[PDB]
Amino acid sequence: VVSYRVPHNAAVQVYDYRAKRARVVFGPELVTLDPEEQFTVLSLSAGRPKR
Amino acid sequence: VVSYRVPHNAAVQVYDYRAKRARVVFGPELVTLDPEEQFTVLSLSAGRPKR
Amino acid sequence: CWLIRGPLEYVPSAKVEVVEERQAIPLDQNEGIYVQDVKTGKVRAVIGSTY
């Protein structure tokens, strides 16, 4: 069972595609992906100033 | 059992992921991490003036 | 097919064949695996205690 520990001051969004329901959680907790849940892959700017 | 001695004037934050509860302790004490507790790894500025 | 478990002693009866030795799955707090009920194809995720 794939599970990711969420950082203290951060958040993560997932969607249970099989059941048709979204959910979002924040704080120092661990998200446990259901059989058809998937993380929201968020490509952000970084590098040196901003890429 | 992993345990860290906290410095006299400092603090450390941990989170028991299995039980869903955060805790923070300060003073010259020792923190004993529960089976699924983890330290808050805080990357700070240092080096010569500030990195 | 069927499964036999429990602290006992089995022997191949004069009608049946052994397929495999069901073992190797220990889970703890905030841990688990994905299992698919082949008869119905019901993919699910069991977590917590050993299963």
UniProtKB/Swiss-Prot annotation, chain C:
Localization: Cytoplasm; Nucleus
Post-translational modification: Phosphorylated on Tyr residues after EGF stimulation.
Subunit structure: The vault ribonucleoprotein particle is a huge (400 A x 670 A) cage structure of 12.9 MDa. It consists of a dimer of half-vaults, with each half-vault comprising 39 identical major vault protein (MVP) chains, PARP4 and one or more vault RNAs (vRNAs). Interacts with TEP1. Interacts with PTEN and activated MAPK1. The phosphorylated protein interacts with the SH2 domains of PTPN11 and SRC. Interacts with APEX1. May interact with ZNF540.
UniProt remark on domains: MVP 3 mediates interaction with PTEN.
Function of the protein: Required for normal vault structure. Vaults are multi-subunit structures that may act as scaffolds for proteins involved in signal transduction. Vaults may also play a role in nucleo-cytoplasmic transport. Down-regulates IFNG-mediated STAT1 signaling and subsequent activation of JAK. Down-regulates SRC activity and signaling through MAP kinases.
Protein name: Major vault protein
Organism name: Rattus norvegicus (Rat)
Section covered of the full-length record: 356 to 406 of 861
